[PDB]
Amino acid sequence: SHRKFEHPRHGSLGFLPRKRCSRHRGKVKSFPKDDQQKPCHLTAFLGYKAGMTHIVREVEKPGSKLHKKETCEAVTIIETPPLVIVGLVAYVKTPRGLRTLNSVWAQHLSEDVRRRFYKNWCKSKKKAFTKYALKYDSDAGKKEIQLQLEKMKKYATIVRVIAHTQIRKMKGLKQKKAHLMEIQVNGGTIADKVDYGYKFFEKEVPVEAVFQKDEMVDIIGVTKGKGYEGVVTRWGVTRLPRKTHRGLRKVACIGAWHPARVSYTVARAGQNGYHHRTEMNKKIYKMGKSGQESHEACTEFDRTEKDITPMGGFPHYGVVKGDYLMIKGCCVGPKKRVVTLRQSLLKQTSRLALEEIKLKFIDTSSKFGHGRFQTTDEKQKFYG
Amino acid sequence: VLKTELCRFSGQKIYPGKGIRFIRSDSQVFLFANSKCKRYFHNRLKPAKLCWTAMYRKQHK
Amino acid sequence: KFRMSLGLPVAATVNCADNTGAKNLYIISVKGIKGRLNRLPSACVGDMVMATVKKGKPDLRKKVMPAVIVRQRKPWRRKDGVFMYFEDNAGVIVNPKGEMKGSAITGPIGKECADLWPRIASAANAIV
RNA sequence: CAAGGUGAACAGCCUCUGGCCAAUGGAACAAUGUAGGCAAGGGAAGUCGGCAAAACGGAUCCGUAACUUCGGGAAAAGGAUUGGCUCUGAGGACCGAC
RNA sequence: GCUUGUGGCAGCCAAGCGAUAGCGACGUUGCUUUUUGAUCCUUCGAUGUCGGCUCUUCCUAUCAUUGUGAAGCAGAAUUCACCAAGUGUUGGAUUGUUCACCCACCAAUAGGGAACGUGAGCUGGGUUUAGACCGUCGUGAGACAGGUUAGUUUUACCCUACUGAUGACAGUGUCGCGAUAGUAAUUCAACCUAGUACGAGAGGAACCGUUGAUUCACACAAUUGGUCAUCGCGCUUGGUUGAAAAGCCAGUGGCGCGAAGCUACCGUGUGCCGGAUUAUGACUGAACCCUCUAAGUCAGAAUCCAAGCUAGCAUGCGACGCCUCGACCCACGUUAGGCCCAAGGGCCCGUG
RNA sequence: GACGGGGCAUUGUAAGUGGCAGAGUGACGAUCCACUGAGAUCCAGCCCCGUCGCAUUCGU
Ligand SMILES: [K+]
Ligand SMILES: [K+]
Ligand SMILES: [K+]
Ligand SMILES: [K+]
Ligand SMILES: [K+]
Ligand SMILES: [K+]
Ligand SMILES: [K+]
Ligand SMILES: [K+]
Ligand SMILES: [K+]
Ligand SMILES: [K+]
Ligand SMILES: [K+]
Ligand SMILES: [K+]
Ligand SMILES: [K+]
Ligand SMILES: [K+]
Ligand SMILES: [Mg+2]
Ligand SMILES: [Mg+2]
Ligand SMILES: [Mg+2]
Ligand SMILES: [Mg+2]
Ligand SMILES: [Mg+2]
Ligand SMILES: [Mg+2]
Ligand SMILES: [Mg+2]
Ligand SMILES: [Mg+2]
Ligand SMILES: [Mg+2]
Ligand SMILES: [Mg+2]
Ligand SMILES: [Mg+2]
Ligand SMILES: [Mg+2]
Ligand SMILES: [Mg+2]
Ligand SMILES: [Mg+2]
Ligand SMILES: [Mg+2]
Ligand SMILES: [Mg+2]
Ligand SMILES: [Mg+2]
Ligand SMILES: [Mg+2]
Ligand SMILES: [Mg+2]
Ligand SMILES: [Mg+2]
Ligand SMILES: [Mg+2]
Ligand SMILES: [Mg+2]
Ligand SMILES: [Mg+2]
Ligand SMILES: [Mg+2]
Ligand SMILES: [Mg+2]
Ligand SMILES: [Mg+2]
Ligand SMILES: [Mg+2]
Ligand SMILES: [Mg+2]
Ligand SMILES: [Mg+2]
Ligand SMILES: [Mg+2]
Ligand SMILES: [Mg+2]
Ligand SMILES: [Mg+2]
Ligand SMILES: [Mg+2]
Ligand SMILES: [Mg+2]
Ligand SMILES: [Mg+2]
Ligand SMILES: [Mg+2]
Ligand SMILES: [Mg+2]
Ligand SMILES: [Mg+2]
Ligand SMILES: [Mg+2]
Ligand SMILES: [Mg+2]
Ligand SMILES: [Mg+2]
Ligand SMILES: [Mg+2]
Ligand SMILES: [Mg+2]
């Protein structure tokens, strides 16, 4: 018989299976559509989640009750020091889909990125790319490099840069192995893309070359793991009555007599968390550039000299010394987790997209307690 | 920044984006710095008796 | 109105802050809210509710009448990032067009209530 | 047979004499259990049903309705108080205890 | 399971009502298996018999929401019909209910199936064991399909299914592709439009735009809230170490506060672009002046397919790094057209 | 790496010494005040840096 009352189903079938992600670094599953009229540029970046704080700003939005009034907003800090370009990858079209044409690597690769090619770096002879580097010394070897680049200009339809992070700049990460990813170039002609990506070899590309203030971006990462979980927390089903024999944290009926099988749509217990997620439309509130006034947490209204890092450091992270992004709201994953930042796939012709953010105050109180001072200088002057 | 408030119970500074505001039945506004200063004043503890508050230090100095 | 924390579900009894003669209002439903299975309809400051009078004048009792919540004990966040609450839960009897049945209000009222209901805002003493 | 303290008390809780650490051990803290807790705001809307839980609780003072077989109801209901310290008064035997 | 009288739903005719806006008597044709009967085919070396709670899917005979056609459609509202099952369909009083009937909210509170879904999922209020009352019946023991009250709900470690977890498949690692499978967003309000269109008047819309909220989903912890054996600090009862200081026991002695972590619509953030079409309305246009159709076209949706998002051991694939029996033969394109009228040809020591 | 130092945080002012502070009693005496926002704890999954250490397989 039909169910007595209607309620919508718990959870989405569009994120199935709720398993552990097969990767740790978030993966771009689709780059923005290439517009060959625009200049050559990168479409993605890698960063690390430092922590959260809250800001105060005055809202300019006609028709809203918040118009000309200040609002408090939680922001996530993502430390994004510049990436190093170490290679180029070309793709050609094919009736089966895109296919890697060839790749060209730079002569100098740091040991941080070379650790990525080893399970046990310190037990090995560290021979990776040692003979490849010899093409840049002879003259027949340089001929191959130029021939590979010319093949890229003639046959490729997609050109991507091979870039890695400078993971040793963040000492609190306690990691020497860099993160490596492919980033698409989305401007100009194929010859323009190849020339643009080749001039960047062994060079640092800052976050300001990819994103700007007040832009909506997509954040890709793996959420926080939680291990084996029951249906009440994993799927959000309701608890049974207190009187329930053999426990109350289950789904009561897991299916009818027919079909004589359990369906894939019924909530079951299993892994919760550590899933790949692509979250879009996160606004950039600030770009903190190392060696500039924009790096400090002082605003035009607050002239107090303070750093972005809260008192006592970012809990479980450390001190932010490199370039960073302030982003409205929450972000996937725990602290220290590597996050992939991608340009929006759609046109951002909206008021929230086109709004101009002006910060009034940045909180730098300690997040390890009920912090009440904005700086260590203020705390010491208070106690004498 | 400049628009900062004082705690009604402990007398310490409150920065924008924080604060617990309690309205008493007689239209009195009490702003509290955090959960400790709010639980006190609801347990009816007098701030002049707690050594760490501004009022106590004012009377004892 | 912005989202506020809901503190007053159905069967909550709140103080009557006007001078009509009612002592308490017993909330039986909240207007404007479509439901979910097993979820109790819940009101906050600035919501019109259907209530009865359990204590008060005999002529006010035994009838369903509209009322607007003016004070709530459950803390709610304002956009400036401050959490606010009152010492008690209170409401005022109105008509379905939003006019106050009484003439005077005891105690303060919320700014969220005054914004929506100009006639309640006119009879209020303090608007915090 | 049956000790000391608290206390009205062979209550509960701690201790002395005497007796025991015998109940397979080690590593780790997933789901679901079992046993035991807390939880903002609301307060039975849950459920056949307040099931379960929570609230009450000792002592002292005040005060206590209908009804009644005049014996009760009655600890009805409803209020207030209670620590520590320094003292003071009263109550005895031929110096003492509460 | 068969049947479909009865139950429910849908048609044909057109006497009438107000012929076919909407209805429709007298007749007459069907469909369906959420009614009840009829039957007795399966099961009596047993398929756990009501109802509700929980949870997922499915249908359409569509209640609301999207797009339309009609009116006895001025507006507002309402009614009839079409394409449509994408998304919703609620909180309560009495009752064991199913069914019912009222209160209220709502865009709306549509109907149903899945062994009358679902008891090794629960519950056990009802039915229906043994105790015991009452009424009626019986000489009686006892009966009642009448009422009432008290009455044990067993087992999964097996196979599969489902949810997750490792993993071989001719070195090892990094970066990739993407067949295929899944899938998601939803509804309402305020303001402006506007007291405008319309209307004698009373009344009284809507598009665009803007700002919010509901239901759902996916995250997250800056703040607020919750959580304590941080046994972190403080206070405190009884005991105990000759006192004091310092502790300990009372399985967490108790109380207050309590970071961290976890966590709440009880907190915060985010949730998506193109193509093809349905219904319908049209263009051109014959058949045969006309004609949305015959050929040929257009616009078109809460629709579909993509894209995006999740997986990807698809025994699939790419790039890169590092080394212990003569098997003879390449045109595109069209058949209401390019000599052809099939390789039914041509080539080749075809011969040792 | 182990300590340690600093930052940050929680609780709420330690022990000890001293006081012509202290109801009163015949030296006792709850408590109060000063040293003293003191003392204690703080990664175990917080942040930043003087003392001491540091076997089994695989060939495309
Ligand atoms: K059912
Ligand atoms: K959640
Ligand atoms: K429940
Ligand atoms: K409703
Ligand atoms: K457990
Ligand atoms: K009840
Ligand atoms: K029939
Ligand atoms: K049988
Ligand atoms: K019994
Ligand atoms: K798809
Ligand atoms: K906490
Ligand atoms: K290889
Ligand atoms: K001391
Ligand atoms: K002190
Ligand atoms: Mg239904
Ligand atoms: Mg993709
Ligand atoms: Mg049971
Ligand atoms: Mg914190
Ligand atoms: Mg329910
Ligand atoms: Mg004896
Ligand atoms: Mg005694
Ligand atoms: Mg005893
Ligand atoms: Mg045993
Ligand atoms: Mg064991
Ligand atoms: Mg509670
Ligand atoms: Mg109450
Ligand atoms: Mg009830
Ligand atoms: Mg109910
Ligand atoms: Mg009942
Ligand atoms: Mg009980
Ligand atoms: Mg009585
Ligand atoms: Mg019939
Ligand atoms: Mg007829
Ligand atoms: Mg059998
Ligand atoms: Mg069975
Ligand atoms: Mg059986
Ligand atoms: Mg249909
Ligand atoms: Mg449907
Ligand atoms: Mg059936
Ligand atoms: Mg059944
Ligand atoms: Mg059973
Ligand atoms: Mg059952
Ligand atoms: Mg079963
Ligand atoms: Mg029974
Ligand atoms: Mg019986
Ligand atoms: Mg007889
Ligand atoms: Mg019975
Ligand atoms: Mg006119
Ligand atoms: Mg002691
Ligand atoms: Mg002992
Ligand atoms: Mg205890
Ligand atoms: Mg939420
Ligand atoms: Mg025509
Ligand atoms: Mg057509
Ligand atoms: Mg079209
Ligand atoms: Mg330290
Ligand atoms: Mg550690």
PDB file of C-alpha atoms (C1' of nucleotides) in Angstrom, chain D residues 4-6 12-15 36-41 44-49 83-84, chain E residues 51-53 91-93 96-97 124-125 225-228 238-240 249-250 252 266:
ATOM      1  C1'   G D   4      35.267   3.534  64.692  1.00  0.00           C
ATOM      2  C1'   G D   5      33.099   8.065  61.931  1.00  0.00           C
ATOM      3  C1'   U D   6      28.709  10.636  59.771  1.00  0.00           C
ATOM      4  C1'   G D  12      23.927   4.740  52.372  1.00  0.00           C
ATOM      5  C1'   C D  13      29.252   6.321  52.196  1.00  0.00           C
ATOM      6  C1'   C D  14      34.544   5.938  54.285  1.00  0.00           C
ATOM      7  C1'   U D  15      37.881   3.264  57.888  1.00  0.00           C
ATOM      8  C1'   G D  36      25.027   5.404  32.966  1.00  0.00           C
ATOM      9  C1'   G D  37      24.865  11.163  32.062  1.00  0.00           C
ATOM     10  C1'   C D  38      24.149  16.172  30.036  1.00  0.00           C
ATOM     11  C1'   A D  39      21.756  19.287  26.550  1.00  0.00           C
ATOM     12  C1'   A D  40      19.844  26.162  24.121  1.00  0.00           C
ATOM     13  C1'   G D  41      14.413  27.506  23.081  1.00  0.00           C
ATOM     14  C1'   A D  44       3.434  15.918  26.170  1.00  0.00           C
ATOM     15  C1'   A D  45       2.971  19.006  20.302  1.00  0.00           C
ATOM     16  C1'   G D  46       5.443  12.281  21.217  1.00  0.00           C
ATOM     17  C1'   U D  47       2.439   7.743  22.248  1.00  0.00           C
ATOM     18  C1'   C D  48      -3.151   3.369  22.629  1.00  0.00           C
ATOM     19  C1'   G D  49      -1.490   5.391  26.943  1.00  0.00           C
ATOM     20  C1'   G D  83      27.178  26.564  56.434  1.00  0.00           C
ATOM     21  C1'   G D  84      31.464  28.228  59.231  1.00  0.00           C
TER      22        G D  84
ATOM     23  C1'   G E  51      -3.441  -0.785  12.874  1.00  0.00           C
ATOM     24  C1'   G E  52       0.182   2.747  13.399  1.00  0.00           C
ATOM     25  C1'   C E  53       5.743   4.246  13.421  1.00  0.00           C
ATOM     26  C1'   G E  91       0.893  20.298  12.419  1.00  0.00           C
ATOM     27  C1'   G E  92      -3.088  18.694  15.747  1.00  0.00           C
ATOM     28  C1'   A E  93      -8.234  17.230  19.317  1.00  0.00           C
ATOM     29  C1'   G E  96      -6.575   0.554  18.578  1.00  0.00           C
ATOM     30  C1'   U E  97      -8.188   1.686  14.151  1.00  0.00           C
ATOM     31  C1'   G E 124       1.315  -4.537  20.866  1.00  0.00           C
ATOM     32  C1'   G E 125      -3.572  -0.322  21.625  1.00  0.00           C
ATOM     33  C1'   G E 225      24.646  27.414  21.515  1.00  0.00           C
ATOM     34  C1'   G E 226      25.321  22.170  23.319  1.00  0.00           C
ATOM     35  C1'   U E 227      28.683  18.448  25.173  1.00  0.00           C
ATOM     36  C1'   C E 228      33.559  17.025  30.018  1.00  0.00           C
ATOM     37  C1'   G E 238      31.454  12.416  54.713  1.00  0.00           C
ATOM     38  C1'   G E 239      35.795   9.543  55.726  1.00  0.00           C
ATOM     39  C1'   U E 240      41.144   8.993  56.058  1.00  0.00           C
ATOM     40  C1'   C E 249      38.481   7.010  48.665  1.00  0.00           C
ATOM     41  C1'   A E 250      32.812   7.492  47.695  1.00  0.00           C
ATOM     42  C1'   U E 252      32.567  10.503  37.214  1.00  0.00           C
ATOM     43  C1'   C E 266      19.801  26.167  17.698  1.00  0.00           C
TER      44        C E 266
END
